[PDB]
Ligand binder design. Structure first.
Ligand SMILES: O[C@@H]1[C@H](O)[C@H](O)CO[C@H]1O
Length: 271
């Protein structure tokens, strides 16, 4: 069997566990051998994973960057070693990449901000819990959100990163609440941070602030069905994983593939 390596940014996130479950499932069918390596949100650990793979007979590198501007060195490592690189979910700012499979995050952010102005109203006071700073996913969701901010004339009380983490989202929202109790709505750039934020509000006795997440994870949906989470922007993690192995297969077969592969978004609300 040929070996395909998946270098995922972290396994401490349901989304990436689904992205990896999809890859595994597709590789299994196509007959490939998939090696999964956790970078644990550490650019240095990521870089160390790519060097380790190059001497292992890794045919294709499927990589989800910890930092879109720092992964440049690890991608050029694979280039020198003549191992094709396909970035999943987050793009690389440098290095030679064969194909990029991701969602339209600039869109998903705007959809988020439009739904907020629909339920909370124009001129709503909002707090944005951003994701890992130099990742393209966070950078894009912020751009799209700013489109809703400008269009719906939102008053952004605060905007701060909680690194796509639940606990960190719980603590970031806790301190922001202390200084901004008049917050009407929260846009959390992923479901983990949204669930964290929902717990902070609970702790503060504010079961009235409108929270919108992103990803549509199993937990992210549960909360929607319990009326706890107003809405989340569902992504298809399992399909960004499958599309990675499939595109990896076609490249190993000499077939020419597209430099970009989009995956649909879908607003999720209770019903
Ligand atoms: O798109 C992914 C998901 O939103 C995940 O929850 C955090 O990292 C982002 O890049």
């Amino acid at each position: 069997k040929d070996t395909i390596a998946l270098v995922v940014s972290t396994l401490n996130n349901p989304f990436f566990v689904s992205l990896k479950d999809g890859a595994q499932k597709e590789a299994d069918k196509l007959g490939y051998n998939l090696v999964v390596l956790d970078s644990q949100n550490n650019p240095a650990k990521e870089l160390a994973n790519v060097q380790d793979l190059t001497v292992r007979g890794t045919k294709i590198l499927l990589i989800n960057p910890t930092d879109s501007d720092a992964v440049g060195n690890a991608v050029k490592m694979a280039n020198q070693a003549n191992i094709p690189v396909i970035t999943l979910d987050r793009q690389a700012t440098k290095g030679e990449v064969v194909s990029h499979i991701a969602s339209d995050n600039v869109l998903g952010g705007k959809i988020a901000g439009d739904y907020i102005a629909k339920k909370a109203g124009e001129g709503a006071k909002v707090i944005e819990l951003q994701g890992i700073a130099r990742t393209s996913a966070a950078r894009e969701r912020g751009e799209g959100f700013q489109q809703a901010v400008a269009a719906h004339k939102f008053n952004v009380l605060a905007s701060q990163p909680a690194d796509f983490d639940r606990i960190k989202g719980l603590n970031v929202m806790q301190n922001l609440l202390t200084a901004h109790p008049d917050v009407q709505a929260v846009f959390a750039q992923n479901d983990e941070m949204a669930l964290g934020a929902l717990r902070a509000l609970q702790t503060a006795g504010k079961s009235d602030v409108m929270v919108v997440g992103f990803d549509g994870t199993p937990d992210g949906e549960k909360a929607v069905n319990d009326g706890k989470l107003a809405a989340t922007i569902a992504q298809l993690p399992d399909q960004i994983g499958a599309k990675g192995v499939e595109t990896a297969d076609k490249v190993l077969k000499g077939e020419k593939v597209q430099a970009k592969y989009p995956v649909d978004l879908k607003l999720v609300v209770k019903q």
